[PDB]
Structure 1
Amino acid sequence: MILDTDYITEDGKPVIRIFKKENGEFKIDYDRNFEPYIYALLKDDSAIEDVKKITAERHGTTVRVVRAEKVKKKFLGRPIEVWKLYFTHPQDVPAIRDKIKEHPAVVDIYEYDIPFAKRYLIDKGLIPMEGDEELKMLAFDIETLYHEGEKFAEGPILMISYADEEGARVITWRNIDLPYVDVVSTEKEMIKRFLKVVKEKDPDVLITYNGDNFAFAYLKKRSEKLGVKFILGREGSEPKIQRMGDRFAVEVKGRIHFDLYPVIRRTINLPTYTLEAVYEAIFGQPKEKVYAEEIAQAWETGEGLERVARYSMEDAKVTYELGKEFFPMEAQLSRLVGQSLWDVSRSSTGNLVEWFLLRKAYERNELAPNKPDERELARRRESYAGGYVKEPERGLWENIVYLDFRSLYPSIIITHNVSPDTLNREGCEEYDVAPQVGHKFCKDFPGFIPSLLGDLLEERQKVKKKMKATIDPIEKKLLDYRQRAIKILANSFYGYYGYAKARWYCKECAESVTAWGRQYIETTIREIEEKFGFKVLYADTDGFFATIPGADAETVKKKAKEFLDYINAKLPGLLELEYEGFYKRGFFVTKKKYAVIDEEDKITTRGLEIVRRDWSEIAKETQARVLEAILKHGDVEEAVRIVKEVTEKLSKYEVPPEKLVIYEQITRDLKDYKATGPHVAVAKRLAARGIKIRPGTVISYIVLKGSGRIGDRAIPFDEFDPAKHKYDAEYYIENQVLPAVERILRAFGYRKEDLRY
């Protein structure tokens, strides 16, 4: 299968490499014949000669238009005639560009920001990740020596761990006595051995967890300190650290660096995103964390290293298992979009739709819109509207089902033929007209985007049936991946339509989909209420929760399924709800916020978690305790007893001052800060006394009883004397603990006043 593509310059000429793995054998194919190009639109077909002779100079050499060619295409369905301007080297384009545009005879340019290696994938109709191939895969993690305030990677790496189908192992430069540890002499040797293991195992995929930001950069700086040629590429080269806009991404040539963190962070909601959180959420069991200060100990002592190594072998073992769960999904998205898994797994859905469209656009000789310019952008961004809103029921409900709207939207786009090339077309036989908001969609021919969604959904239906004709759970799981990927992809078109940066943006389409949505959602709600006696507890843009007042779990579930058939059969054409889960009890605070608990007792929240940087254990501990009281034991009064008791204990200084410490971190030379928060004012005055304060320093403070700013009365927990000092219990109650729990409990009728003391 194709794993990746890139190009290399040689003798000034571009060369495409296609990286494959076919029948257990890695190989690199070459293409020297692929010409870069853009599209230009001309006022008159004659001024071509003035253009076919434009030139700009970059990196010494002058750049010409190696060739022009007049070609006929479609732009948004309507025929268009443009000039396809060829070149010599990909890099020519971002330089000759604005000079071709500026020319008075040129109206516009198109398809001038498509990365050459991706341009290749599309035009030759090549598709990464297709075929039977068993890819060979390796997870790895490192565990470093850390002390607060050190420059990045000043500390040495202590261990490198790796795992795959054969098991996990650790490489460390210190004698430890476990059957999966490989002792070597130094860190320089540790690294070199890791490098050898990778070279020998030759994996197609290296799996990290945030390797994009930590591990690879660490290993880089260390390999420079110790003169190790850090070679992981299959063509003998080092990890290529790349800037993606806001963050970094690391590439290993001829392999697939699969960074789990951006995949899991897109996939699931979570307060935290640690390895041990992620592993737990997905697999059930917890992962016994072993902290940095606890690590530096066992190393500098030499005692309890056998613990610290178990942690590293598990980081690797865990990272592998997560990879194996998440890979087959990203692999499906890669096939579907037709781009490398290295790109796809790092993309937003907005961005998958875009690449998908770009490919299909080509398949259909359809010139692509350009991105928004800077003003056309801001114009869109001001014209923003959301989705379906509905007020929630107060109170704590039982046996609740959740039903999913997300699949309605692409069905709507298909059913009412919603797309920019069908929007307000003059002279049609038939129209669909969006409710409330009035946009007309031609119905004579299928539009571009409805056309392709029709194919995706058909494909999904085909897969879903094939799953029913198979008992083998391995093949069933594999098909299930394909089925869910399509759902993910298809369901991204709604947000995409009103996505300001989108090429095929269309406000009218988004509003139109929102209106038809409101209608079908409203119908569904009316149906489940009137005809099935459900009460709808909460409903937003992607689903609603509902129950039968007073019914029991078996009943509600039976009745929910019956409603699914009824409404799925009744709603027009391809429109269908989906049953996305059941919850023991739950409560719903506003348009956007709620908490529910399932039949295994896993609480889930939305818009309720403490999210502030300057939090405190006492705040977090109390909210946690409240939710458990409400959701797990269904006992609102206990939750009120608990909050009261905490506010009491607070004001009578009997809350362990530890629980009041706030950990905030320093990011720059204090000089540089343009404004001074508390933790910065604490630190600032520590520095005025010549104490070591560096980027990376964790300020740990209490707020004390007094007046005015929080900065003026926050002290280092270090300097806190229980005997002498008095904590600001008013702050901890009003600013910290109560805002964490107030919204939850007002929902049940309780006022702030009731929780106070």
Structure 2
Amino acid sequence: MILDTDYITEDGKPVIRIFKKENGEFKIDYDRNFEPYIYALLKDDSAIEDVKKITAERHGTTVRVVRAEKVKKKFLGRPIEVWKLYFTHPQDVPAIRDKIKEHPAVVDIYEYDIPFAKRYLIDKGLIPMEGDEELKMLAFDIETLEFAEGPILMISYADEEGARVITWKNIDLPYVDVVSTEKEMIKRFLKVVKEKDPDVLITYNGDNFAFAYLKKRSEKLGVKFILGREGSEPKIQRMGDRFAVEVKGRIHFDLYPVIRRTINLPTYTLEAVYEAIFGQPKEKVYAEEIAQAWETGEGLERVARYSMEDAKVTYELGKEFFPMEAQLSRLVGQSLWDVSRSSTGNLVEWFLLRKAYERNELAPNKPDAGGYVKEPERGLWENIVYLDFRSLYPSIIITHNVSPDTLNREGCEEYDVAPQVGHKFCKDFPGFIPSLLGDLLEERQKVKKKMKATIDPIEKKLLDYRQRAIKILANSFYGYYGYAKARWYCKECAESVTAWGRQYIETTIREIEEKFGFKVLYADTDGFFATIPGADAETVKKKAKEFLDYINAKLPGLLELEYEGFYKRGFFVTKKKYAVIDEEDKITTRGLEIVRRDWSEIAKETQARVLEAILKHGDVEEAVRIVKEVTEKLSKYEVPPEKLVIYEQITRDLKDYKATGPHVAVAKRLAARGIKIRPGTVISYIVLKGSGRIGDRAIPFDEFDPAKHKYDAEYYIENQVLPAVERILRAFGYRKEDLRY
């Protein structure tokens, strides 16, 4: 199968490289006659020759329009006549782009920002990750003692053969390979990768830590960090605001971005994520404990176990998600490296671009939400279930032909009109998106049929994934319509789908209350929470599953709902803000928790203690008491200043800042005194009492003296503690005035 595409430059000409795994072997095929191009709409076709004369400079090399060919395409369901302009190198596009548009005869340009290797996949009809090839995979993690200043203590890895650890101190455990030095540890890990020859290297946050650290130690220790199959090092790319790492010939599959896009929980640690997916706790050994262990030589077995489990948990996490991302890559028609790192929004973009090319539909340029909100029931509810609405929206798009090319169409015999908002949509022909959405579902059902028929357990799990991948993709179109940088953006399309949704949501809530006796506690654009007052947990589950079968029978065709989970209890504050606890006593908040370094520990600690009293123990009055004592204690100067420190990172040169927050005020005073302030530096400040802007009163905690300085009790009460609990407790009829001392 096709694993990735890139290009290389030979004699100024782009050469496409197609990385493949066919018949068990890894091979790189090449293509030398694929040409970059853009499109251009001209006011006057006579001017194409002068447009062909437009030049530009690229590293002092002359860039020009090599060829021009007139082409008839369709733009948003209407014929359009543009000029396809060819070039020599893909790097010519951004050098000459704007001069072609700046030309007075050229109205605009189209398909001018499509990466060359992706353009290739689309145009040649190539689908990555397709077919029957078992890919070999290896997980790995590191343990480290300025970035990459200290040495790497351990490198763990895991696969089918098991999970081992490489360290440079003698640890008597069977899975621990003991090596002489850190350099030889890294070198030993390089051998194992080249020897196992995996197709996929799995990591957790390897884009922003593992690889980069490994680079800088190998940079310092004089090792050439070769993981690429052709002999290259890992390339650290830049994805706008963040970094990312490719390994040529292999697929670096970082689990972190995938997981955040897939599931929803407050803290995205390796243990939390593993606990949410596999329902088993994992011990976390902290960085203060590791240094202590490595320094003395006391507890290196526990540190070595933690590193081994890190590798093993990552591999089995890798085994769960990769097949799904594999399938999404086949549907979208882009590499797993890209699809694994994209937003749901951009997954729909690349799907639509590929389909646009197949139907000869010219792509619109980039520019470069909202929904149902029932006010929830108040207080703490026993035995809650969540049912998902998202499945409604694709069928709504399909049935009502909702598309930008069908919006307010001129001169049709049939129209479906949206409720409330009143937008119209043509019915004489099927829209671009709706017909594509229709086929995604028709394919999903055809997959489900063949799924049940086939009994090969491995292919029964493979076809299960394919169907699941179509669901994630189909469920993304609704959101994509209102996506900010969306090519096929249409606010009317979204409002309309929302409007038509209300009916089915209303009807669903109506049925579940009357025919089944539930009370809906919270309902939003995505789903709703519900219970049966006075009922046992098992009844609720049983009755909920009975409702699912009923409602999906009544809602025509592919109109569906899903049963997501049961929760022992919860409360509900406002839109997208609630908290729940499952039968395993695992708390799950949305839009409430504040577990971040820019909030003080006292605020974090008190909130967590409040969520515990309410959810695990069911004592709201104890939660109120907790906050009362804390606010009393803050004002009496009994809370340790260590719990009051705010950590905040400066992210570029101090001169760049257009607006000064507290941490930028603290940093600028340090810089005025010569003290090192670089991007990445972390200001840890505390707020002293008195007058002035918070920034004027804030000092560094290093410069803090408990005896001399007096922190700002009012600030930590009113701006930190109370804001973190007020909202939660407001859903129980408690106001700020009830919480202060």
TM-score, normalised relative to structure 2: 0.92
Specify whether residues 663 and 552 from structure 1 end up closer, same or farther in structure 2 by C-alpha distance, changes over 3 A only: same
Specify whether residues 123 and 728 from structure 1 end up closer, same or farther in structure 2 by C-alpha distance, changes over 3 A only: closer
Say if 1:6 and 1:16, in contact at 8 Å, map to a contact too: yes
Residue 386 of structure 1 deviates from its aligned partner by: 1.4
Q: 2:56, 2:723 → 1: CA distance?
A: 61
Residue 213 of structure 1 deviates from its aligned partner by: 1.5
Q: 2:406, 2:320 → 1: CA distance?
A: 40
Aligned position for 1:755: 739
Residues 564-605 of structure 1, C-alpha deviations (whole Å, 9 max, x = no match): 344333335532222222222221112331112222222211
Aligned position for 2:235: 240
Residue 675 of structure 1 deviates from its aligned partner by: 7.1
Say if 1:409 and 1:491, in contact at 8 Å, map to a contact too: yes
Specify whether residues 690 and 427 from structure 1 end up closer, same or farther in structure 2 by C-alpha distance, changes over 3 A only: closer
Q: 1:481, 1:688 → 2: CA distance?
A: 58
Specify whether residues 627 and 48 from structure 1 end up closer, same or farther in structure 2 by C-alpha distance, changes over 3 A only: same
Residue 632 of structure 1 deviates from its aligned partner by: 2.5
Residue 167 of structure 1 deviates from its aligned partner by: 1.6
Residue 207 of structure 1 deviates from its aligned partner by: 1.2
Q: 1:131, 1:112 → 2: CA distance?
A: 32
Q: 2:67, 2:700 → 1: CA distance?
A: 70
Residues 335-389 of structure 1, C-alpha deviations (whole Å, 9 max, x = no match): 110000011111111101000001111111211112225xxxxxxxxxxx51112
**Higher mean displacement: 688-697 or 397-406:** 688-697
Specify whether residues 359 and 681 from structure 1 end up closer, same or farther in structure 2 by C-alpha distance, changes over 3 A only: closer
Q: 1:723, 1:104 → 2: CA distance?
A: 72
Say if 2:266 and 2:590, in contact at 8 Å, map to a contact too: no
Say if 2:374 and 2:524, in contact at 8 Å, map to a contact too: yes
Residue 318 of structure 1 deviates from its aligned partner by: 2.0
Say if 2:267 and 2:595, in contact at 8 Å, map to a contact too: no
**Higher mean displacement: 181-190 or 686-695:** 686-695
Say if 1:171 and 1:181, in contact at 8 Å, map to a contact too: yes
Residue 618 of structure 1 deviates from its aligned partner by: 3.2
Specify whether residues 55 and 724 from structure 1 end up closer, same or farther in structure 2 by C-alpha distance, changes over 3 A only: closer
**Higher mean displacement: 85-94 or 353-362:** 85-94
**Higher mean displacement: 33-42 or 558-567:** 558-567
Residues 270-306 of structure 1, C-alpha deviations (whole Å, 9 max, x = no match): 3332223322222223332223333333333344333
1:380-529 alignment runs, 5 A limit = 385-469=369-453, 474-529=458-513
SS of the residue aligned with 1:719? coil
* Structure 1: runs of 5 or more not aligned: 146-150, 374-384
Residue 136 of structure 1 deviates from its aligned partner by: 1.0
Residue 719 of structure 1 deviates from its aligned partner by: 7.7
Residue 661 of structure 1 deviates from its aligned partner by: 5.0
Q: 2:38, 2:445 → 1: CA distance?
A: 38
Residue 251 of structure 1 deviates from its aligned partner by: 0.8
Q: 1:669, 1:80 → 2: CA distance?
A: 48
Q: 1:59, 1:668 → 2: CA distance?
A: 28
Specify whether residues 58 and 709 from structure 1 end up closer, same or farther in structure 2 by C-alpha distance, changes over 3 A only: closer
Specify whether residues 408 and 214 from structure 1 end up closer, same or farther in structure 2 by C-alpha distance, changes over 3 A only: same
Say if 2:142 and 2:210, in contact at 8 Å, map to a contact too: yes
Residue 53 of structure 1 deviates from its aligned partner by: 4.4
Residues 677-703 of structure 1, C-alpha deviations (whole Å, 9 max, x = no match): 666777788899999887766666665
Residue 467 of structure 1 deviates from its aligned partner by: 4.6
Residue 725 of structure 1 deviates from its aligned partner by: 7.5
Residues 177-197 of structure 1, C-alpha deviations (whole Å, 9 max, x = no match): 332222222222222222222
Residue 468 of structure 1 deviates from its aligned partner by: 4.4
Q: 1:727, 1:61 → 2: CA distance?
A: 62
Specify whether residues 657 and 443 from structure 1 end up closer, same or farther in structure 2 by C-alpha distance, changes over 3 A only: same
SS of the residue aligned with 1:189? helix
Aligned position for 2:60: 60
Aligned position for 1:148: none
Q: 1:54, 1:13 → 2: CA distance?
A: 20
SS of the residue aligned with 1:444? coil
Residue 117 of structure 1 deviates from its aligned partner by: 0.8
Say if 2:166 and 2:189, in contact at 8 Å, map to a contact too: yes
Specify whether residues 465 and 403 from structure 1 end up closer, same or farther in structure 2 by C-alpha distance, changes over 3 A only: farther
Residues 144-181 of structure 1, C-alpha deviations (whole Å, 9 max, x = no match): 23xxxxx3222222322222111222223333333222
Say if 1:289 and 1:311, in contact at 8 Å, map to a contact too: yes
Specify whether residues 45 and 635 from structure 1 end up closer, same or farther in structure 2 by C-alpha distance, changes over 3 A only: same
Instruction: Select which of 695, 719, 722 maps to 2:706.
Output: 722
Say if 1:280 and 1:286, in contact at 8 Å, map to a contact too: yes
**Higher mean displacement: 430-439 or 31-40:** 31-40
Say if 1:415 and 1:573, in contact at 8 Å, map to a contact too: no
Say if 1:388 and 1:540, in contact at 8 Å, map to a contact too: yes
Instruction: Select which of 267, 289, 309 maps to 1:314.
Output: 309
Residue 504 of structure 1 deviates from its aligned partner by: 0.9
Residue 40 of structure 1 deviates from its aligned partner by: 2.2
Residues 643-696 of structure 1, C-alpha deviations (whole Å, 9 max, x = no match): 334445555666566545555556678898787766677778889999988776
Alignment root-mean-square deviation, CA: 3.0
Residue 560 of structure 1 deviates from its aligned partner by: 2.6
Instruction: Select which of 532, 538, 556 maps to 1:554.
Output: 538
Residue 518 of structure 1 deviates from its aligned partner by: 2.2
**Higher mean displacement: 532-541 or 476-485:** 476-485
Residues 114-134 of structure 1, C-alpha deviations (whole Å, 9 max, x = no match): 111111111111111011111
Specify whether residues 472 and 739 from structure 1 end up closer, same or farther in structure 2 by C-alpha distance, changes over 3 A only: farther
Specify whether residues 714 and 444 from structure 1 end up closer, same or farther in structure 2 by C-alpha distance, changes over 3 A only: closer
Residues 74-132 of structure 1, C-alpha deviations (whole Å, 9 max, x = no match): 22222222222223222222223223323333333221211111111111111110111
Residues 236-268 of structure 1, C-alpha deviations (whole Å, 9 max, x = no match): 111111111111111111110111111122223
Specify whether residues 465 and 583 from structure 1 end up closer, same or farther in structure 2 by C-alpha distance, changes over 3 A only: farther
**Higher mean displacement: 336-345 or 399-408:** 399-408
Specify whether residues 528 and 40 from structure 1 end up closer, same or farther in structure 2 by C-alpha distance, changes over 3 A only: same
**Higher mean displacement: 61-70 or 452-461:** 61-70
SS of the residue aligned with 1:574? coil
Say if 1:415 and 1:574, in contact at 8 Å, map to a contact too: no
Residue 712 of structure 1 deviates from its aligned partner by: 6.8
Q: 2:46, 2:426 → 1: CA distance?
A: 36
**Higher mean displacement: 96-105 or 129-138:** 96-105
Residue 417 of structure 1 deviates from its aligned partner by: 0.3
Residue 724 of structure 1 deviates from its aligned partner by: 8.1
Q: 2:137, 2:105 → 1: CA distance?
A: 54
Q: 1:554, 1:280 → 2: CA distance?
A: 24
Specify whether residues 734 and 106 from structure 1 end up closer, same or farther in structure 2 by C-alpha distance, changes over 3 A only: closer
Say if 2:229 and 2:248, in contact at 8 Å, map to a contact too: yes
Specify whether residues 233 and 106 from structure 1 end up closer, same or farther in structure 2 by C-alpha distance, changes over 3 A only: same
Residue 447 of structure 1 deviates from its aligned partner by: 0.8
Q: 1:729, 1:410 → 2: CA distance?
A: 52
Residue 704 of structure 1 deviates from its aligned partner by: 6.0
Residues 1-59 of structure 1, C-alpha deviations (whole Å, 9 max, x = no match): 10001111112222111101112211011111222222222334444444444443423
**Higher mean displacement: 587-596 or 295-304:** 295-304
TM-score, normalised relative to structure 1: 0.90
Specify whether residues 290 and 675 from structure 1 end up closer, same or farther in structure 2 by C-alpha distance, changes over 3 A only: farther
Say if 2:266 and 2:589, in contact at 8 Å, map to a contact too: no
Aligned position for 2:8: 8
Say if 1:470 and 1:476, in contact at 8 Å, map to a contact too: yes
Specify whether residues 550 and 107 from structure 1 end up closer, same or farther in structure 2 by C-alpha distance, changes over 3 A only: same
Residues 545-576 of structure 1, C-alpha deviations (whole Å, 9 max, x = no match): 12223333333333333333443333355322
**Higher mean displacement: 117-126 or 101-110:** 101-110
Q: Percent identity among equivalent residues?
A: 100
Residue 728 of structure 1 deviates from its aligned partner by: 5.2
Residue 464 of structure 1 deviates from its aligned partner by: 3.6
Specify whether residues 750 and 233 from structure 1 end up closer, same or farther in structure 2 by C-alpha distance, changes over 3 A only: same
Residue 332 of structure 1 deviates from its aligned partner by: 1.1
Say if 2:265 and 2:590, in contact at 8 Å, map to a contact too: no
SS of the residue aligned with 1:351? helix
Specify whether residues 662 and 285 from structure 1 end up closer, same or farther in structure 2 by C-alpha distance, changes over 3 A only: farther
**Higher mean displacement: 587-596 or 681-690:** 681-690
Aligned position for 2:169: 174
SS of the residue aligned with 2:18? strand
Specify whether residues 282 and 73 from structure 1 end up closer, same or farther in structure 2 by C-alpha distance, changes over 3 A only: same
* Structure 2: runs of 5 or more not aligned: none
Specify whether residues 500 and 309 from structure 1 end up closer, same or farther in structure 2 by C-alpha distance, changes over 3 A only: same
Specify whether residues 105 and 531 from structure 1 end up closer, same or farther in structure 2 by C-alpha distance, changes over 3 A only: same
